[PDB]
Design a protein around this ligand. Sequence first.
Ligand SMILES: *[C@@H]1O[C@H](CO)[C@@H](O[C@@H]2O[C@H](CO)[C@@H](O)[C@H](O)[C@H]2NC(C)=O)[C@H](O)[C@H]1NC(C)=O
Ligand SMILES: *[C@@H]1O[C@H](CO)[C@@H](O[C@@H]2O[C@H](CO)[C@@H](O)[C@H](O)[C@H]2NC(C)=O)[C@H](O)[C@H]1NC(C)=O
Ligand SMILES: *[C@@H]1O[C@H](CO)[C@@H](O[C@@H]2O[C@H](CO)[C@@H](O)[C@H](O)[C@H]2NC(C)=O)[C@H](O)[C@H]1NC(C)=O
Ligand SMILES: *[C@@H]1O[C@H](CO)[C@@H](O[C@@H]2O[C@H](CO)[C@@H](O)[C@H](O)[C@H]2NC(C)=O)[C@H](O)[C@H]1NC(C)=O
Ligand SMILES: CC(=O)N[C@H]1[C@H]([C@H](O)[C@H](O)CO)OC(C(=O)O)=C[C@@H]1NC(=N)N
Ligand SMILES: CC(=O)N[C@H]1[C@H]([C@H](O)[C@H](O)CO)OC(C(=O)O)=C[C@@H]1NC(=N)N
Ligand SMILES: CC(=O)N[C@H]1[C@H]([C@H](O)[C@H](O)CO)OC(C(=O)O)=C[C@@H]1NC(=N)N
Ligand SMILES: CC(=O)N[C@H]1[C@H]([C@H](O)[C@H](O)CO)OC(C(=O)O)=C[C@@H]1NC(=N)N
Ligand SMILES: *[C@@H]1O[C@H](CO)[C@@H](O)[C@H](O)[C@H]1NC(C)=O
Ligand SMILES: *[C@@H]1O[C@H](CO)[C@@H](O)[C@H](O)[C@H]1NC(C)=O
Ligand SMILES: *[C@@H]1O[C@H](CO)[C@@H](O)[C@H](O)[C@H]1NC(C)=O
Ligand SMILES: *[C@@H]1O[C@H](CO)[C@@H](O)[C@H](O)[C@H]1NC(C)=O
Ligand SMILES: [Ca+2]
Ligand SMILES: [Ca+2]
Ligand SMILES: [Ca+2]
Ligand SMILES: [Ca+2]
Lengths: 394, 394, 394, 394
Amino acid sequence: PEFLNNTEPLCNVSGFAIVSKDNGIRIGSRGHVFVIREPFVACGPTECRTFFLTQGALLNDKHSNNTVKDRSPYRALMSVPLGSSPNAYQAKFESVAWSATACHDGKKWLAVGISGADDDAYAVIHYGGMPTDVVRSWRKQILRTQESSCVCMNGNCYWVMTDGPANSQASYKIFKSHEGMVTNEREVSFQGGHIEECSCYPNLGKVECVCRDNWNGMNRPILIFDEDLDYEVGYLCAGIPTDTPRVQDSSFTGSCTNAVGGSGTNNYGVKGFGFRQGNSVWAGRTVSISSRSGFEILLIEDGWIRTSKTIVKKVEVLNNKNWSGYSGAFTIPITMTSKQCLVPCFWLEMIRGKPEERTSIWTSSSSTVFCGVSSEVPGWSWDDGAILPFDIDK
Amino acid sequence: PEFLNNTEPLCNVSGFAIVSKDNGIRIGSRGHVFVIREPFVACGPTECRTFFLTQGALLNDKHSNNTVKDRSPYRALMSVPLGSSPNAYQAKFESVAWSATACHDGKKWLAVGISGADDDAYAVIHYGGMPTDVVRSWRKQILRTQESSCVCMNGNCYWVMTDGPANSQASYKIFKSHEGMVTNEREVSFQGGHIEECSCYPNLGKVECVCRDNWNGMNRPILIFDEDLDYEVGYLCAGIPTDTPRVQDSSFTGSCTNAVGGSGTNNYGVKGFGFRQGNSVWAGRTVSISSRSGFEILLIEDGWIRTSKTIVKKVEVLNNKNWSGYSGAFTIPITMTSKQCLVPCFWLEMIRGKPEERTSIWTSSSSTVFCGVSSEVPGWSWDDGAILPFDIDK
Amino acid sequence: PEFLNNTEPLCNVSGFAIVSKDNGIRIGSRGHVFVIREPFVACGPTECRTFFLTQGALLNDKHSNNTVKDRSPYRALMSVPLGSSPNAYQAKFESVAWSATACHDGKKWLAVGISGADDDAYAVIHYGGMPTDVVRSWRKQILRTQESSCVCMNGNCYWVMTDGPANSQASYKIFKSHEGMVTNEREVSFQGGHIEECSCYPNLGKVECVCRDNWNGMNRPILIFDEDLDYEVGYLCAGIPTDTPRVQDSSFTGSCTNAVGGSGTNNYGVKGFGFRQGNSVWAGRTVSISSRSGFEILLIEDGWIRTSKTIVKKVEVLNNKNWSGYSGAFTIPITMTSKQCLVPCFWLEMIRGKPEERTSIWTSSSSTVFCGVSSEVPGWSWDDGAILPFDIDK
Amino acid sequence: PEFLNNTEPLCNVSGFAIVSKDNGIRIGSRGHVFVIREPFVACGPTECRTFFLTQGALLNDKHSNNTVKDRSPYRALMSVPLGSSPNAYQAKFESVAWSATACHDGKKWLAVGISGADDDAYAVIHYGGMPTDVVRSWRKQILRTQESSCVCMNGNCYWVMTDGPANSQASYKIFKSHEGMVTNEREVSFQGGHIEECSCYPNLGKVECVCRDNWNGMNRPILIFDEDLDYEVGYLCAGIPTDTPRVQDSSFTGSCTNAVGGSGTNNYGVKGFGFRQGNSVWAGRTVSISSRSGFEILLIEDGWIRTSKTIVKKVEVLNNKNWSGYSGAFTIPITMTSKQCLVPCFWLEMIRGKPEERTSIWTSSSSTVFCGVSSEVPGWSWDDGAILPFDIDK
Ligand SMILES: *[C@@H]1O[C@H](CO)[C@@H](O[C@@H]2O[C@H](CO)[C@@H](O)[C@H](O)[C@H]2NC(C)=O)[C@H](O)[C@H]1NC(C)=O
Ligand SMILES: *[C@@H]1O[C@H](CO)[C@@H](O[C@@H]2O[C@H](CO)[C@@H](O)[C@H](O)[C@H]2NC(C)=O)[C@H](O)[C@H]1NC(C)=O
Ligand SMILES: *[C@@H]1O[C@H](CO)[C@@H](O[C@@H]2O[C@H](CO)[C@@H](O)[C@H](O)[C@H]2NC(C)=O)[C@H](O)[C@H]1NC(C)=O
Ligand SMILES: *[C@@H]1O[C@H](CO)[C@@H](O[C@@H]2O[C@H](CO)[C@@H](O)[C@H](O)[C@H]2NC(C)=O)[C@H](O)[C@H]1NC(C)=O
Ligand SMILES: CC(=O)N[C@H]1[C@H]([C@H](O)[C@H](O)CO)OC(C(=O)O)=C[C@@H]1NC(=N)N
Ligand SMILES: CC(=O)N[C@H]1[C@H]([C@H](O)[C@H](O)CO)OC(C(=O)O)=C[C@@H]1NC(=N)N
Ligand SMILES: CC(=O)N[C@H]1[C@H]([C@H](O)[C@H](O)CO)OC(C(=O)O)=C[C@@H]1NC(=N)N
Ligand SMILES: CC(=O)N[C@H]1[C@H]([C@H](O)[C@H](O)CO)OC(C(=O)O)=C[C@@H]1NC(=N)N
Ligand SMILES: *[C@@H]1O[C@H](CO)[C@@H](O)[C@H](O)[C@H]1NC(C)=O
Ligand SMILES: *[C@@H]1O[C@H](CO)[C@@H](O)[C@H](O)[C@H]1NC(C)=O
Ligand SMILES: *[C@@H]1O[C@H](CO)[C@@H](O)[C@H](O)[C@H]1NC(C)=O
Ligand SMILES: *[C@@H]1O[C@H](CO)[C@@H](O)[C@H](O)[C@H]1NC(C)=O
Ligand SMILES: [Ca+2]
Ligand SMILES: [Ca+2]
Ligand SMILES: [Ca+2]
Ligand SMILES: [Ca+2]
């Protein structure tokens, strides 16, 4: 067992092929499957796993009542092999958590799980299944993190956390760890900007993150940092907005530096992702500009470096008649691919129940996962597929 | 870990002994078992596994409604150890798929799963659990493959795919891969012939396939190819027809070269198998000439090389009062047998529900598996055994 | 991985301590647990496992109806780790079987499973999970075997089979195998005797078996054989009868050579066991002389070599107010104990449902397991504990 | 595989961070989860596991009736990975047991399980899953042990047992074992004292235990011993009482030598724990002085060596509106932490059902687990979270 370098360039890809679909909610109509949300994927040297935040309750059970709620003492980070339902008997316990990130350094799994009261939460860092360190809330206002994979390079693992208001200026920090111990941290200066739920991946030895602005931006913040935690922060340059809510493309003008918002888009957002491709960018977004429905990915020419509106490729993986949700980035290491570059992949959360489906008492999600390939790949619509309401709703 | 040679001759066998029976539908009356169809078996160096296409739903659940349907975004290729039910908690996710093939090269599992729209489907190739390559539909008409084990020899794995009409001339291709990457392909010229759902096995360093003609043939196509993808294509010579539907043996005249059909047998078929035995052949077939009921295997003297009607052995493993379905071939590698030849085995799918059992809202199947041995073995009737209708049907 | 020698002497023990209890039927009131019977235990170098014959159906399901029946195409030999319930999700498939034996040679598991029609059954031998050989019925009358662990010594594994009438002279054979291939067999001459369901264990390089006479004997046959399959056959000498049904001890006179029966005890029996202890013997029996209720084990002074009635120790592990059933012998190898002798252990089957509990539609069993120790150990009553009837019975 | 030294000093810690929460009862509302009580945690070189005593029955099943009862033939010690629910399909069988202790010596798991009649019980010692030795009741009055992790150092494992009256002078013994064999024992002279359910941990090569006095003490006995089983015995000096029931702190005067009781606190207690910190002590207790509700941990200055009332730190992990129960100590070995000291951790049992919740027919518990860290950590209330009554209660 050796540490993964993970210092290779990110692969350039021309399409995204479906890798898995867990069908968790369909299965949970009868099987014993956790109510969850905030799923994500992370890969070790030999296996990829799906992580998720349970509600400490099962689908179609009375304890699934009121699971639209975000935080409780019953939520836990757990994982299953990629493609498995988040079920009661395969789930591996990772951390107590209502917010989390996880990744593998080549030797062991790192899991960071936040629990506790809103005004005094703390992250517990688990390494190889053992609690190694803690990070306390420094602003005492819902300490929270990525809800996707962290990044490990050369034995050091990195992640981003936020503490402070949901709809105004908050505080943003980058963390560095080795074998589960925090070894460095840096506060990111981003006045007028808002960073949450970063989707991060390694690219040529740096960590590149595409995040959620829940304040004044319908464009996505970009945060790039190195091993010293030196950073650049700004917004995805592209003249195509990729948060939700947002306005139609023709009503939007991009910015590399400033949050662009207004027009009824302020004070909300959704976790999402993008992948730099030289000067261009693959960016995901819901099909709807107002709701978490549909999902498509766009290749925007020069979209990483300028306010480009040129869409060279677009692929839809979920049509607008179906519910989506969070999306996030991860990479496949050289040990599984034998390539000289890191393969970019994304996952998609499909939320069922509240608030969009009010005749259900619960909220959960299922997922699809896609990986970049060297050729164009057709889209389709791989929807959650569950038939609501469920038994427990009647 | 080294690649399996798999270049040995196929064993000559005199009988087939039952190896496993999963009783999946009986168990799924109460247990949590996937609705499936198209099961198959493939063996690695140290383990054999049962693969299957789920419907992304469980038996006796409302989501099992309308599962007679062949393709959807919810179907997945999964696997369990040989003999296990295809259940919710042991199932290993392999690929998103409504058509599939899988095999083991000695080092890792290869799984090929087709999903997407009928007019723009694509296969995703998974190797060691990682997506490595894709194959796009080239005729834009239900790209489809074996629904049984592919063949690996000396580190290269091979499979057959079809694209085009179900009931007229289509296009047939052979694929070669190494570590999950397609390295060669060849289109098979077969004018007037139709190839689907090939059952393939290694024999003296070549791949021998017995397939389904869904057009004008009640005899089975035979496709034989080598590492260069050079091939011979034709029909099983035997003057005994082995597709379903077919006519009675006495109304049939064999052909090595031509599809023999008519008499109400055109435009359908069932996946099946055969094993060359020198110049002879073991071939499976349903007992009924018109429906998927019963199952028997026949040793036909010189049936691989001429229009022989001489049946030297016949063994029934399912009587005609019980539902059958697909059947397929696989082999056991030298690493498990210590023999100097590859052991021929077959599996049998037993379909319950629609269309034959109209009082059920669903369709699933269970399996039995048999392996060749050096002596004669008695038959019996190992039927699915489930008592229909089920709870969900009322 | 090397073959277990297993040529050590059997340990002398002064008591039996409980090792496990699976509580399978209690658990199966709600959990997903197979209907079974004929459980047994066998140990490999590093693990002991519980084997069992399922009915291919789960407790509290409609398919459990009529499971008092002994043979069907749906029965399978499966296994779980020692102490686990025989449940739907941990069970490992071993063989299709309505009669079976299994053991471990130090390198791999050997499983022998009999299925097929009563008049043409056959055993399939599985080695390392691969079908290696077959044994056909030679009398065409319910080929059957031990329903307990076989014995492996120096890489060869041995077991006993019977074919012929249940209530008159039948045919008895000993088998020798290496890596799953039958390498020798010997028919046992036993005129006027009847041998079924042998409980066998290694002792100083020979196999010692205590069996069931289902014909004229309420005393148990003893069969001892060596690697050449040379044998001695007779009855347990002790003047204490240990089959069921039997008469009270004071009405019984022992014999080393002859079946002793009559008085309403002919034509039935129950699988049981004994362990030679020098010239003495530990022998199990039901507490009731007429029914399968209660269980006790007796140390009979010189009971292996003469018609002794001297009981030096007696321990009850199940009181006569509770249902018992089959019992069987196995040993723990030196690799788990670091001893210079083989530890004798036994398991006890506790049958619930038909025929004793007529208000239930089903029959299943659970187990307790006990191992010999160097000191006296108190008894108790570890009964099945399920509360009948079950939901499905109403 | 080598034996763990475990001779390092115990770490000094300033706070306790939550490591896991199993949510077992919430999950068991629908999932298949054992009714349990007396959970505990023990760590091997590479994994921590949760152990528990089942009632041989599942939640929400009729067999859960009357599970307030402490002892039966159906109770078993089983384990799951840390954080998992004690469910029917992940549970590993360890021992038949209505009282137990378990630990890992670096090479194998040791499990000690007591079963049998109240007046003639015996412990079976399991090592590497094999029964190795027995300990008989020496006072014939409910032989019983820790219900938490034992301690292994340099290949020897130690635990404490009690036999005799629950509410008057009993007999207390320390045991030493190597590879599952008892190699030494010592009776502890403690006239007027009462020791049960010791929570023990290694500290600088000695075993330090904090126990339950069920007779005349609302203060906790302390037992410290070395490899020769030489011991010191007394009470936790602190002038803060930590048993339940107890009186308010201001009504209590500490003692290092004598049981301090009366005022309605005699003849009961609850399993609990403490950790020496130089001359100080971290000690757990229920928040309520009279009932098993709430849980807090206190750092008492010099509380190990004198009758101090100085509380320097206090952290609540369960508020007094929620049910608690047993608590216990364990340590994390150097192999998981790479530290030079042993990390102190504790678990908390949260009991639901009888006797406090009389509208339920059953009693079970779930757990939370916490580990010491080098900084202060906020508290919260991580309650069981199940909504009673359950289906089976109506
Ligand atoms: C992905 O594509 C980008 C853009 O084409 C590649 O970046 C170029 O790399 C070459 C070779 O070093 C340089 O000469 C160019 O200056 C780069 N262009 C830009 C815009 O950065 C990159 O090499 C590709 N990555 C991989 C892994 O193939
Ligand atoms: C299976 O049987 C076939 C037919 O008997 C065997 O093929 C023969 O092999 C011998 C030895 O090389 C040749 O002399 C013959 O010409 C072959 N006959 C035919 C019809 O091909 C084959 O060897 C057998 N296979 C195995 C593995 O034993
Ligand atoms: C079990 O007990 C028997 C009977 O006491 C032991 O058999 C004796 O072994 C000694 C030593 O070789 C011989 O001198 C005696 O002749 C034997 N007696 C009989 C009746 O066989 C045997 O050694 C013991 N087994 C073990 C493993 O300790
Ligand atoms: C935990 O704290 C205690 C108390 O401060 C430490 O014990 C001291 O150790 C030093 C160094 O050997 C001695 O000089 C003192 O006499 C000790 N004091 C007492 C009260 O025992 C102990 O070293 C600490 N343990 C660890 C692992 O850091
Ligand atoms: C820690 C916390 O509760 N995180 C929130 C998150 C949050 O409200 C926004 O980012 C605003 O700050 O939004 C949402 C969301 O669906 O919008 C889900 C999260 N749920 C959980 N991760 N549990
Ligand atoms: C891809 C596709 O849908 N394949 C079909 C197959 C097909 O219709 C025929 O071969 C004709 O082309 O027939 C049948 C069949 O039962 O006849 C099952 C298959 N179901 C699936 N593999 N899902
Ligand atoms: C193969 C067969 O059916 N074996 C029988 C066995 C048998 O009837 C007697 O030994 C008489 O021959 O008896 C019994 C028994 O409970 O008496 C259970 C067995 N059930 C099974 N092993 N399935
Ligand atoms: C062996 C036995 O039954 N141990 C008891 C224990 C005991 O009654 C007291 O310590 C008094 O002696 O108390 C309690 C308790 O909840 O107070 C649970 C235990 N339950 C079990 N471990 N099963
Ligand atoms: C969910 O909560 C609401 C409000 O308390 C209640 O009316 C409803 O019955 C609950 N559903 C269940 C299944 O408990
Ligand atoms: C299955 O579908 C049919 C037609 O939509 C419907 O009538 C029937 O009730 C469905 N069954 C279930 C269990 O939903
Ligand atoms: C079991 O079989 C009997 C006889 O056929 C029948 O009367 C009874 O209803 C059956 N029970 C179930 C649950 O099917
Ligand atoms: C539990 O036991 C009581 C007393 O015997 C009984 O009244 C009650 O119905 C039982 N509950 C169940 C589910 O059997
Ligand atoms: Ca926004
Ligand atoms: Ca046809
Ligand atoms: Ca008899
Ligand atoms: Ca007390």
